[PDB]
Design a protein around this ligand. Structure first.
Ligand SMILES: [Mg+2]
Ligand SMILES: [Mg+2]
Ligand SMILES: [Mg+2]
Ligand SMILES: [Mg+2]
Ligand SMILES: [Mg+2]
Ligand SMILES: [Mg+2]
Ligand SMILES: [Mg+2]
Ligand SMILES: [Mg+2]
Ligand SMILES: [Mg+2]
Lengths: 61, 294, 208, 169, 157
RNA sequence: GCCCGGAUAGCUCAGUCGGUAGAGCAGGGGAUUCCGUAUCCCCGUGUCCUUGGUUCGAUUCCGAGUCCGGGCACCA
RNA sequence: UUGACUGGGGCGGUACACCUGUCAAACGGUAACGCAGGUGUCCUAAGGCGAGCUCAGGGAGGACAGAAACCUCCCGUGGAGCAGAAGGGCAAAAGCUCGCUUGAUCUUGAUUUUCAGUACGAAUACAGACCGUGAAAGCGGGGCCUCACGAUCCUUCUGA
RNA sequence: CUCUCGCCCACGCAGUUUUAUCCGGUAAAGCGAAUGAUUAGAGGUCUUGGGGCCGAAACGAUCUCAACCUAUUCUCAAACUUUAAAUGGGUAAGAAGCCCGGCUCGCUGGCGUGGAGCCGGGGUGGAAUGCGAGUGCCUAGUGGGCCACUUUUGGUAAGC
RNA sequence: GUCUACGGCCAUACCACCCUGAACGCGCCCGAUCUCGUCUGAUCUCGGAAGCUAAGCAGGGUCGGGCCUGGUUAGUACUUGGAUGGGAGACCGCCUGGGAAUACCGGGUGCUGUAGGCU
């Protein structure tokens, strides 16, 4: 009672029936998987730029 | 008649490198000593290229670019008679005195002279310069002997300590300095401050006066030629360590002096060698036609 | 041995004798030059090919029977050692036999179907030469009749073509004698070795 | 006319190849140490053949190399038992030579039945000033065809010093 | 059936072109990869330590992460009915700078400066590029001679 | 009519360790004995199936062909 | 209760989990009881680091020595080796010898491969410890790379 | 459901091309290029294998088959390859872009170094053609296919 | 006009042989007391400076071998799409677009980066 093993016939036309899509690259990709030592510095750079900066910033700006 | 030598071994042949065929480097140790860990992205990794030759020693600090290595500052030993050491420019004391010249000249260029004076007196012990906070940091630098067998007492490690006593932050161990007992584990620093001032070649002068003055003229002829006497030798280097620490700037000779340009042959053209063949073919057919009919 | 209808039109990829086949018997052709092999170049000027018209497989056994049919005719009329037959294509393609019933359903059917080796055949392209004899120019009408008798032992269609070269070399017969004359060609037995004018000069000094 | 381009003895190397180790190979190292004055080093095999009594990594032979002034003083011993004569085909294509002897007591060694009798193989390589660049570490180079030494140029040397005979048979 | 193993179809493509074997040139390590640089993936066969897969060899991605010896590259993989923005850690010998945007960066550069050159000079230079137009109505010259009559050669075997 | 190993003196058979072709019958010649029986000994006799490949080395190993005998054997 | 696959089934075999080359049609993917094979291990070094050295083979020579012993020179783009099956790779080496060792350790995530874009396995780049080796930059969290293995529930030992 | 067009420029998208830029080892071709196969003669000669003689004998002297070597020559390769298409694959073709000023940092470090981050400002017209897109939920049927160009695997062939 | 030190591209730089080499250098060379390492101061390490361009090295030469690059081969071989094209078939021709490779022939034969020295 043997059957048929494997085809990819008809399979490509049903992929494109709904239109294979680009992944929608959207602005500000996340930082998932970036190495931790670079990442641990960079948010220390973020938690001190709002605090101890903006009186000696606007007068330069 | 014998065997099948090459004839198409050249068809497949793959030459190594221009610098491996000449034999200078190895590129296995270069690859691990030169390329920057690239999340620092531009920061140059600085070397200490030390090469001894016949009759000279060459000390350089270089870093790598992609079009070739860039050299910051270099110090030689043919230069070193200008500080007093006029003869014997390959021994261990000249090697250390080149490394101090190479260390003081660099920190003059970067402006770190009055900070980082290193070890002014020479004790031979493991000095290790640190970073004084608030000022520029110590110049970090990595040694390469290149292709030399780094056994203990190699004079590439003399120039390693003239650097370290000059204020270059170089990671090293004292295990290869002359004065490290092999079967023991101690480091006799007094042997090294003897070895660094050249009393061993003063005692090899002293071993040669009282044994055989004929061999003491065969070797060591140019120490006697000007005036070098083995009790004076330990002070002569110490008077040169004072001199290199107060003026390392390397003035240059103005190098023009001539305008002449012809010493070796130019490559002859196609037409100049194509007619050389028809000239050779002419002389062959005139000796077969004429000198075999006669 | 199955008919040559069955092992005809070039269907499979070339499946040559190597460390992967290891069990294919010998070709019935084992010798390939049968005239006078010892001849020089100027002893037999003209040559004659038989040319394939179609792309098929000739067995090694059919090449055995072909050259025998040509060797026999030319010793009758051109005489022995007055010709040089050369069969030019070699059998390297191994055909297979799915040797069933080794009257029963009992062995398998098509279950283990890949065959054992059965013989060697030769894959021939269109316009590729099969046989080539070379003789005197007095023997031109015996070239064709030798190869006309040899073409009835091949399947399909062959055309017989008197070539324009000199012998079994690659240079043309009209200008060979004009150009072997001075230096440009030297004879070494059954072929001609071209010399350019771009080697080292000492071999030119060895010449002349 | 050719300054500092002269044939000098580069080294002299010796061996005895015994078919087995143990007692017999050990006191043969005593012999070769008495000729030279420096300790032998033990060579060994890499093909068990099962027809010579050999085995892989089994210490089959002893050898040593002698350089400088002591090489010629063992060589001149070897040329008097062979009586200053060689054959033409003892001169290799690279020029260097060898001759070999039997019964080592024909050379200066006193006899002992507890030691026995061994045969040497003296092998001389030749040299010029400049051959070190093929064995130098740093800038290793080839030697140049005008500087390498030939078969016919080493036999014209063995005639010159040591007044030898070529014996061209 | 078909042995789902890593490094499977690569008898030729993780291999050297020919007569460039041996140890790698050192300028490959002295290359500067910042975030957002467009790099393409060509895995060699000498360094075993970080080669990507046989699915990315010949694709082109974008750097999102730079570490000591390797670079995180976000590439697009065609899986069956959809594509996936996939990120892979690749060591530095297996990639290079793609020249694919560097012929766009030159135009943007010599485009903006030529744009303000029309402000000072007052013109309508039309810096937008066009495809190949049909050929202009030009003029040939058969000076003196007359055209060459060629005719098809006969058949000879 | 498919597979398993065998092809050797006149026969037959073992071994053809990658290095000789040797037991044993039959005939031949001796010796022994009063003469024979047996017996003993020596001699004779190998394309070591055919060709191709693998090392100063193949009958031997490898794998083609020919040949000879020995065999896988379903429900219907 | 008496497996499945299967050119009916049985008998056989494993195409039932896995690796190499081909098939495969120059990205990737792709079938048959398709072809040629391999796996259920081995290793305290065959792991890790450093240093030194070059391999197969061949030529000309060297007492016994001969096709095969050892020594010596010259040539030697890999024609050898790297545990094995193949492919890739590899020459001051990833090969050989020697010297020190245990990173074949502890810990959180990310990613890749198979893929449903799940797991197991295997692998990558890190980060936080603690260590090795080395003059040093470095390199090292097993084997030069691609295979070498296994849930719930149960038991066992370890850990505060 | 979120939006876009209602009335000198589309936000965007694409089973398409152009412009560039990468990727690949198939068809062909190649083997007087490596690996694996394979036919023929010519030259050369250390030689051994075997003959021919001058000869008690002498690598004293003279030929041939073979083996080797050199330059040629015939024929091939799914599990060979220097070379190498066509068709094909990935990316790019701008405002999320370009330029300038400043400031954070515990990361990096001769260094106002390196690199990220944030804030402020300055200039929109950026290949062709076509089209309005974006998103989220619940979800049935299906999980025996079959044929034809062309490419292909097993088979003698098959409405296999 | 060249060199040395360090390099980038890795034969247009390699291989074999032959000529030439001013000055600096690089070397060969001379030694084994210390430093170190060997069976052997040959290598490695260390002290030198009596010699020498003989080697290496650097330039140059070869109707050179390779390598590089262009012609021929060739619009050939293959190939994208197309036809109720031919032909018993095998396969061949055309439309539409692309488009190789060897023999054979020609030309080339290292270029430069940082630092320093000779002329
Ligand atoms: Mg000593
Ligand atoms: Mg010692
Ligand atoms: Mg010496
Ligand atoms: Mg010179
Ligand atoms: Mg010279
Ligand atoms: Mg030249
Ligand atoms: Mg040339
Ligand atoms: Mg078509
Ligand atoms: Mg149609």
């Amino acid at each position: 009672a043997k059957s048929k093993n494997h085809t990819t016939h008809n399979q490509s036309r049903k992929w494109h029936r709904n239109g294979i899509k680009k992944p929608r690259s959207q602005r500000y990709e996340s930082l998932k998987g970036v190495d931790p030592k670079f990442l641990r510095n960079m948010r220390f750079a973020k938690k001190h730029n709002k605090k101890g900066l903006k009186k000696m910033q606007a007068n330069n700006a | 008649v014998k065997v099948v030598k090459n004839k198409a071994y050249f068809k497949r042949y793959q030459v190594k490198f221009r610098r491996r065929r000449e034999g200078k480097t190895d590129y296995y140790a270069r690859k691990r000593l030169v390329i920057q860990d690239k999340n620092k992205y531009n920061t140059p990794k600085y070397r200490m290229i030390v090469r001894v030759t016949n009759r000279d020693i060459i000390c350089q600090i270089a870093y790598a670019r992609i079009e070739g290595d860039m050299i910051v500052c270099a110090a030689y030993a043919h230069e070193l008679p200008k500080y007093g050491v006029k003869v014997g420019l390959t021994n261990y004391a000249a090697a250390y005195c080149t490394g101090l010249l190479l260390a003081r000249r660099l920190l003059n260029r970067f402006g770190m002279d009055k900070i980082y004076e290193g070890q002014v007196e020479v004790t031979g012990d493991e000095y290790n310069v640190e970073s004084i906070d608030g000022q520029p940091g110590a110049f970090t630098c990595y040694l390469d002997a290149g292709l030399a067998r780094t056994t203990t007492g190699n004079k590439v490690f003399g120039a390693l300590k003239g650097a370290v006593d000059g204020g270059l932050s170089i990671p090293h161990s004292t295990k290869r300095f002359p004065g490290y007992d092999s079967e023991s584990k101690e480091f006799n620093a007094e042997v090294h401050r003897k070895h660094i001032m050249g009393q061993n070649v003063a005692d090899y002068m002293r071993y040669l006066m009282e044994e055989d003055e004929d061999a003491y003229k065969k070797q060591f002829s140019q120490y006697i030629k000007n005036s070098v006497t083995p009790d004076m030798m330990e002070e002569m280097y110490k008077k040169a360590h004072a001199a290199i620490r107060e003026n390392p700037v390397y003035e240059k000779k103005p190098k023009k002096e001539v305008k002449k340009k012809r010493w070796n042959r130019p490559k002859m053209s196609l037409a100049q060698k194509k007619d050389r063949v028809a000239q050779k073919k002419a002389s062959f057919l005139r000796a077969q036609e004429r000198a075999a009919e006669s | 041995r199955r008919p040559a209808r069955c092992y005809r039109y070039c269907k499979n990829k070339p499946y040559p004798k190597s460390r992967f086949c290891r069990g294919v018997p010998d070709a019935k052709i084992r010798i390939f030059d049968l005239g006078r092999k010892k001849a020089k170049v100027d002893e037999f000027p003209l040559c004659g090919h038989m040319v394939s018209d179609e792309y098929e497989q000739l067995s090694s056994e059919a090449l055995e029977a072909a050259r025998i049919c040509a060797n026999k005719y030319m010793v009758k009329s051109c005489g022995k050692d007055g010709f040089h037959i050369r069969v030019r294509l070699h059998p390297f393609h191994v055909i297979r036999i799915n040797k069933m019933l080794s009257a029963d359903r009992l062995q398998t059917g098509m279950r283990g179907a890949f065959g054992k080796p059965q013989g060697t055949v030769a894959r021939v392209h269109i316009g590729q030469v099969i046989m080539s004899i070379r003789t005197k120019l007095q023997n031109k009408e015996h070239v064709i009749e030798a190869l006309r008798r040899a073409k009835f032992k091949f399947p399909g269609r062959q055309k017989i073509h008197i070539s324009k070269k000199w012998g079994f070399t690659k240079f043309n017969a009209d200008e060979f004698e004009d150009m072997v004359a001075e230096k440009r060609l030297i004879p070494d037995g059954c072929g001609v070795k071209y010399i350019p004018n771009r080697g080292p000069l000492d071999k030119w000094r060895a010449l002349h | 006319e050719n300054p500092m381009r002269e044939l000098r003895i580069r080294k002299l190397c010796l061996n005895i190849c015994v078919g087995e180790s143990g007692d017999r190979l050990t006191r043969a190292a005593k012999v070769l140490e008495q000729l030279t004055g420096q300790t032998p080093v033990f060579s060994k095999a890499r093909y068990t053949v099962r027809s010579f009594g050999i085995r892989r990594n089994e210490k089959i032979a002893v050898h040593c190399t002698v350089r400088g002034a002591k090489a010629e003083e063992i060589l001149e011993k070897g040329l008097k038992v062979r009586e200053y004569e060689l054959r033409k085909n003892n001169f290799s294509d690279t020029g260097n030579f060898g001759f070999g002897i039997q019964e080592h007591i024909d050379l200066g060694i006193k006899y002992d039945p507890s030691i026995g009798i061994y045969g040497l193989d003296f092998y001389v390589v030749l040299g010029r000033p400049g051959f070190s660049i093929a064995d130098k570490k740093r800038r290793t180079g080839c030697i140049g065809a005008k500087h390498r030494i030939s078969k016919e140029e080493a036999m014209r040397w063995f005639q010159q010093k040591y007044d030898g005979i070529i014996l061209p048979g | 059936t078909n042995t789902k193993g890593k490094r499977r179809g690569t008898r030729y493509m993780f291999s050297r072109p020919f007569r460039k074997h041996g140890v790698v040139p050192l300028a490959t390590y002295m290359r500067i990869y910042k975030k957002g640089d467009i790099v393409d993936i060509k895995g060699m066969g000498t360094v075993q330590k970080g080669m990507p897969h046989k699915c990315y060899h010949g694709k082109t991605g974008r750097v999102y992460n730079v570490t000591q010896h390797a670079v995180g590259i976000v590439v697009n993989k065609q899986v069956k009915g959809k594509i996936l923005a996939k990120r892979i850690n690749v060591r530095i010998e297996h990639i290079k700078h793609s020249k694919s945007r560097d012929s766009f960066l030159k135009r943007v550069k010599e485009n903006d400066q030529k744009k303000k050159e029309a402000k000072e000079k007052g013109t309508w230079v039309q810096l937008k590029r066009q495809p190949a137009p049909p050929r202009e109505a030009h003029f040939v010259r058969t000076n003196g001679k007359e055209p060459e009559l060629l005719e098809p050669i006969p058949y000879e075997f």
